[PDB]
Write a protein that binds this ligand. Structure first.
Ligand code: SF4
Ligand SMILES: [Mg+2]
Length: 303
C-alpha cells in the first residue's frame, strides 16, 4: 500500500462513527484491504443478516446495497457512488415479468440478485450464482422463468435438467463475454494449469473450463485442488483476492475484464462517504415489505 493517509483516515472514521465496511470481490485491492468483510453476493447477503453494527458502508453496486438495506430496514446503509449499478440488471422490467407469467403461469419466477428492487417485489425467489442450481432443484415445478442472465439460466437448465425460460431477450454480462480461444491458448502455454470460470460466461467458455462457479466458490477451489497455476475467467478484482489468499499459487487472468461500475468506488470517495455519512440507501416501505419475501425464501430453501 502507498496511500497511507487515506487508509489511516478511513480506519479512524469507521471506528469513530461505528461503521462496518462490506465489500464485493470485484472492488479494487485498496478497498478490499480496508473492508471488514469481502465476499460474493451470497456471502454478503448472509453477513448482512448476521452483523451487529447499526451502520453499514457498502462497497459494490446498487442492487447489492439495496438487498443489504431490505434485510436491515432500521439500519443505515451508505454507498460512496450512487450511480454504481449493473447494466444487465437494468434491462429486465416489471412488464416483461408479467408478460412471461401470463404465458407460462405454472412457472415460478426466479430472479438473480442482479435485478432491480422493484423487480424483486415481483419474484417468487431470489438466487445468486452460488446457489441458483440448488434453489431451482428445490422448487416443485419442472419449469422456471429465470432472469436477467441468459448464461446463468442456461447453466442452471444443464445442471438441473429443468426447463428454464430466460428473460429478457439475451440478457447477459458484458464483462464475462470471454472468447473460448483464450482457453485454447492457455492450454498450449500452461499444460497443467486449471481453468476456473464464472457461470455468466458463454457456453463454449464454460464447457472448456475445469471448474465453473461464483467468485465465492472459486476461492474454495485451491483448498481441494493442488494446481500450481490457475487461470481465472472473471472480473479482474477477483485475481487480487485469490493471490492474497493463496500466495503460494500463480493466478493468471483468462483475459483482462473490468466492470466499470465496480471500479466507481475509490479511496477518495470512500473517505468522503465516511466524512459525510452519505449516500444513504432509502427505499419505500412497500418495496422493503414485498421484496424481503423472495430474499428470505432463498435462505429457507437452502437449508
Ligand atoms: S461484472 Fe457484470 S453482472 Fe457483475 S455487476 Fe458488473 S456488469 Fe453486472
Ligand atoms: Mg404462477
Amino acid at each position: 500500500h502507498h496511500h497511507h493517509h487515506m487508509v489511516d483516515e478511513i480506519l479512524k472514521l469507521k471506528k469513530e462513527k461505528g461503521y462496518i465496511i462490506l465489500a464485493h470481490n470485484y472492488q479494487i485491492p485498496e478497498l478490499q484491504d480496508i473492508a471488514d468483510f469481502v465476499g460474493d453476493s451470497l456471502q454478503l447477503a448472509r453477513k448482512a443478516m448476521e452483523l451487529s453494527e447499526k451502520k453499514i458502508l457498502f462497497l459494490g453496486v446498487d442492487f447489492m446495497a439495496e438487498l443489504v438495506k431490505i434485510l436491515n430496514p432500521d439500519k443505515k446503509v451508505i454507498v460512496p457512488d450512487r450511480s454504481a449499478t449493473c447494466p444487465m440488471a437494468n434491462r429486465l422490467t416489471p412488464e416483461i415479468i408479467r408478460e412471461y407469467r401470463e404465458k407460462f403461469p405454472d412457472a415460478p419466477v426466479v430472479l438473480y440478485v442482479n435485478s432491480t428492487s422493484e423487480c424483486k417485489t415481483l419474484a417468487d425467489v431470489i438466487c445468486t450464482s452460488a446457489n441458483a442450481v440448488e434453489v431451482v432443484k428445490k422448487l416443485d415445478s419442472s419449469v422456471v422463468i429465470f432472469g436477467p442472465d441468459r448464461n446463468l439460466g442456461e447453466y442452471v437448465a444443464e445442471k438441473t435438467g429443468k426447463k428454464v425460460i430466460t428473460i429478457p431477450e439475451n440478457g447477459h454480462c458484458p464483462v464475462h463475454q470471454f472468447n473460448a480461444e483464450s482457453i485454447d491458448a492457455v492450454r498450449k502455454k500452461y499444460p497443467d494449469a486449471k481453468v476456473i470460470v464464472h457461470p455468466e460466461c458463454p457456453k463454449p467458455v464454460r464447457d472448456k473450463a475445469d471448474y465453473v462457479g461464483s467468485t465465492g466458490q472459486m476461492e474454495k477451489i485451491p483448498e481441494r485442488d493442488p494446481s500450481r497455476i490457475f487461470v481465472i475467467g472473471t472480473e479482474i478484482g477477483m485475481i487480487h483476492k485469490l493471490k492474497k489468499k493463496f500466495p503460494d499459487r500463480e493466478f493468471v487472468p483468462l483475459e483482462m475484464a473490468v466492470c466499470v461500475n465496480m471500479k466507481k468506488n475509490t479511496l477518495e470517495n470512500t473517505l468522503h462517504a465516511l466524512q459525510t455519512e452519505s449516500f444513504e440507501v432509502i427505499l419505500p416501505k412497500e418495496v422493503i415489505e414485498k421484496a424481503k419475501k423472495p430474499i428470505l425464501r432463498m435462505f429457507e430453501l437452502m437449508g
